[PDB]
Design a protein around this nucleic acid. Structure first.
Ligand SMILES: [Zn+2]
Ligand SMILES: [Zn+2]
Ligand SMILES: [Zn+2]
Ligand SMILES: [Zn+2]
Lengths: 84, 75
DNA sequence: CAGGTCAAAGGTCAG
DNA sequence: CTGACCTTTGACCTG
């Protein structure tokens, strides 16, 4: 198909579709899932308004997670571990 | 409710009232001759919120409650 | 009441 | 830890 499918609302990278309620990339989907599953807590070393784009999304975990939430990601859409 | 997991049923499937998930799961299991294993005691609880934790026990309950693999049509 | 589809859940593991 | 790549689930649909 087209090389254009969707775009990550958090960082601007390519996206195949929604994850946890929001168009997101493999990076931001994974980071959000791990954050929720492990109940990780982050702190911003700046002013809690760090810019999130593809090239600096890993610089501030606090602000990346806060943007995941602010763009609409749903904690409750993360499920329990399976093994199945 | 679904005889396997008590979720809302979508009607009879393979001989029992079943939800779309247990319906699809059963069909796939049979069509592809899936073989599963239980990592616990082959007594796993299967309800609407736990059904995906153990495929072995889910399938086992599908049969127990009366799902019929003979209603899964050949290729 | 069957069986197919596909978005979005699950998952691993090199780097 | 991250994120590219793989598998299964189940809501929705047709025949
Ligand atoms: Zn992203
Ligand atoms: Zn920050
Ligand atoms: Zn069910
Ligand atoms: Zn089990």
């Amino acid at each position: 198909g087209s090389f254009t499918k969707h775009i990550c609302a958090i960082c601007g990278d390519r996206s195949s579709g929604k994850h946890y309620g929001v168009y997101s990339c493999e990076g931001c989907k994974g980071f959000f899932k791990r954050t929720v599953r492990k109940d990780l807590t982050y702190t911003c070393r700046d002013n809690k308004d760090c810019l999130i784009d593809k090239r600096q999304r890993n610089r501030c975990q606090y602000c990346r997670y806060q943007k995941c939430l602010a763009m609409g990601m749903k904690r409750e859409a993360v499920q329990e571990e399976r093994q199945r | 409710p679904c005889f396997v997991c008590q979720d809302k049923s979508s009607g009879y499937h393979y001989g029992v009232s079943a939800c779309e998930g247990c319906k699809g799961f059963f069909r796939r299991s049979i069509q592809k001759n899936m073989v599963y294993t239980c990592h616990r005691d082959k007594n796993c609880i299967i309800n609407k919120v736990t059904r995906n934790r153990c495929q072995y026990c889910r399938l086992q309950k599908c049969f127990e409650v009366g799902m019929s693999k003979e209603s899964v049509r050949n290729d």
